[model samples]
Target: VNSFSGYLKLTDNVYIKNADIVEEAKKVKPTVVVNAANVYLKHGGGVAGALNKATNNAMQVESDDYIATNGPLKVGGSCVLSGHNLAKHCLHVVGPNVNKGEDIQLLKSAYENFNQHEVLLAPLLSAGIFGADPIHSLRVCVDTVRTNVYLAVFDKNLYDKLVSSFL
Candidate 1:
């Protein structure tokens, strides 16, 4: 069963934890939840899939609307969704598929594009299915947001790996 494994404090307000994003949503009650999506805004797997499922597919519908109106999202572009099941809003960003040095910059752009929110829940962008380095992705996430940010990690092994990397 999933449990609160551990956490690493990047800043006073930014932290990475080995916990379920959905469960963390209940406790933290963030103003916005961030999901990594493709340029086409597809919520197929990884954190996107979990967020889509948790929000009862509302996230996907919102993503579709964004794509329909604004066209495909650029690698660093972001979109905001109002209605959601957990948080009041959801932020969708197109993460990099390849781990180039620009991935951090792209992630930073996504965070900068986001609207003002006191608290945000996000995953390690491009770390899972996209093959980006987890530690570097986490660092990018922490560096981008100054407010309270939660980095959700579901796998114990991944959690251990990240923790070890920090050492």
Candidate 2:
């Protein structure tokens, strides 16, 4: 029913549309979300920060405990943390900064690393402040995800560009 509801039907199940991640989190069952995080796993701001707020700071507390016990998560590494707010768990992943070995290595690795489940919601992992080109980030997202993926695109420009990418 939406004008932006179209998708690239070529390969995997990739769904892209405008969304408020917190709202989507509330509506989804099991709420297994993925946060494009830095190696430190600090949810200071950006997508991670917003999701942290949605979880009533519970994610941060658990994240701190995780790092304290296991040390910082290395790049391309991930771990599912306890979720509050509306979600049940969050798979926090440390993506390669844009300056590192370019192309889709680390970011795509993060996508491929997701554990199988009914459904999982994710934002474009390294697209924004991570310095990755949005188109390149989107390609990795479309190419690597094996299970059902709901890539919440909130930015209007991103939304338009993604809808246009398949054409």
Candidate 3:
């Protein structure tokens, strides 16, 4: 079983690593896989898009239903879905589009709202396509979670940097 076992800690309970997030989901079988979504709950891009594909579009279907009645979720707001392909639940949050250092707190707040889970598998919120530095965004996530948190990075260079920092 080839596994990307390298991990770096932001806190005693939070960890970051470089690996395929989906593969990590398969390996760990986390109870919740958090999806960084837009206010509209659209999973057409970034990590959300990848997760949507992995789940065979079931997430999009649920997201659509949730959005239809509730309107667009506010920034930092979240909703949960069931029957995910790799997890029992999916936590979808409206992460910030952090350009020019704006809305960084909103990004952090999104992570803050993801409490009360046994294990959470997530990516660097607001980093991909949202222009927040992966390291910075990861710091925010790590700072917020009290439960076990695992962050998976797909970029090898980012992974190497994180691994080197810990070493």
Candidate 4:
């Protein structure tokens, strides 16, 4: 597993049973599954921005100026409060300060219940590399575990501003 700190090579392998992410998420599945390429920092919105842009651009949904507060800002110290907007319902998944183990657990849980959605979008940096501003180093990591992945591009009026800095 890749950690925000650094990537470690593993020699031992283990298998997990009953870990179908999409099957369990059927009860509370989202119409669309979105994952940002990277997290924004240093004036960039980070992963939150990518998520927002994906949702707005993919679904053509606009914000209604209504912010929903269901629980604490952070969930399990991995996700933080983020906003989503669509023509119908906007979603927000907050960062929970998750560790590698926690991140894997979360992903497994998502996959078992929630179908792994595809973004068919451009390649964005991962949260670890984006936050660190080292896209090349982070890109070396691959999505081999085969979790649900969704991709997209920036749709909001702020695309140019964010891309210019990285380019």
Candidate that scores best on TM-score:
3
Q: Please give the CA lDDT of all the candidate structures.
A: 0.73, 0.73, 0.78, 0.27
RMSD score of candidate 3 (Å) = 3.1
Instruction: Name the top lDDT candidate.
Output: 3
Query: Model 2: per-residue lDDT, tens digit, 21-124?
Result: 77677776345878877777789887888888887888888888888899888777788887676567788877777755544577778777664544677788
lDDT for predicted candidate 3 compared with the true structure:
0.78
- List, residue by residue over 32-110, the lDDT tens digit for candidate 4: 4323221221112544444455444432232222222232222212121222332122223322223322343232232
* TM-score ranking of the models: 3, 2, 1, 4
Clashes of each: 0, 0, 0, 32
Q: Is candidate 2 or candidate 4 better by lDDT?
A: 2
Off by over 4 Å in 4: 1-44, 51-69, 73-103, 116-167
Candidate 1, 1-167: lDDT as tens digits: 12223557667766677888877765655778788778888898888888788878877887788778989978877777763766777777777877444454576676655436666777777778877778887666666767676678888799888877763
What's the residue-level lDDT of 156 in candidate 4?
29
TM-score of each candidate structure, all chains considered together: 0.81, 0.85, 0.87, 0.28
Q: Give the local distance difference test score of model 2.
A: 0.73
